[PDB]
Design a protein around this ligand. Structure first.
Ligand SMILES: [Ca+2]
Ligand SMILES: [Ca+2]
Lengths: 120, 120
């Protein structure tokens, strides 16, 4: 389901200020990551990334493509392709605590200027 | 509107192989740039970027915010905010001639793996 900025804003409420990352910075990260598409799947030679947060199957969730995943989020990757963001959010917090915002942003400044434009 | 993978595939047909860039490579580029949204507008402290190709008002188009724009594409940035992609494409060709795919991609590798995933 392709979500709108405002719908995403509502749905990511429980991530607000988590780790010190504001809600507007979360919606921005989501835009640049999957364009608000809960079912986005992107493949690489090596891995595959799932849903809105583009969670990979080599470290975070378990795939048929890769059963030998470290599976930190202890979940099957396809749980990140539905409309329920609950489990996506739980996994997104570990990624933040383990690797930081750069998992998603190549440069942080990408989501630090004019943050009020992400406000719904 | 927020177009789907297949809608964008048909709409950018005009660009197939231009500068050597295959069609699946353009769809990949659009995904990563605007998430397929023709009305995306993103602001920086320095400039604003419009539409599908996130064309900036500092060098390519002109708007109320910055009149000192070099305006290489000789056009108003708001023409890059509707559902007709004809003029966006003509301007995207100029950017490709001048700066290359690196206007959109930090690393071309980003859009060279599993190109068949971007096929409709
Ligand atoms: Ca889910
Ligand atoms: Ca247009």
């Amino acid at each position: 389901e392709q979500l709108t900025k405002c719908e995403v804003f509502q749905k990511l409420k429980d991530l607000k200020d988590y780790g010190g990352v504001s809600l507007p910075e979360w919606v921005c990260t989501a835009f640049h990551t999957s364009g608000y598409d809960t079912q986005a799947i992107v493949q690489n030679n090596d891995s595959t990334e799932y849903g809105l947060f583009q969670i990979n199957n080599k470290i975070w969730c378990k795939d048929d493509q890769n059963p030998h995943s470290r599976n930190i989020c202890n979940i099957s990757c396809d749980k990140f392709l539905d409309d329920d963001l609950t489990d996506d959010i739980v996994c997104a917090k570990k990624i933040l605590d383990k690797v930081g915002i750069n998992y998603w942003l190549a440069h942080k400044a990408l989501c630090s200027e004019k943050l009020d434009q992400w406000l719904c």
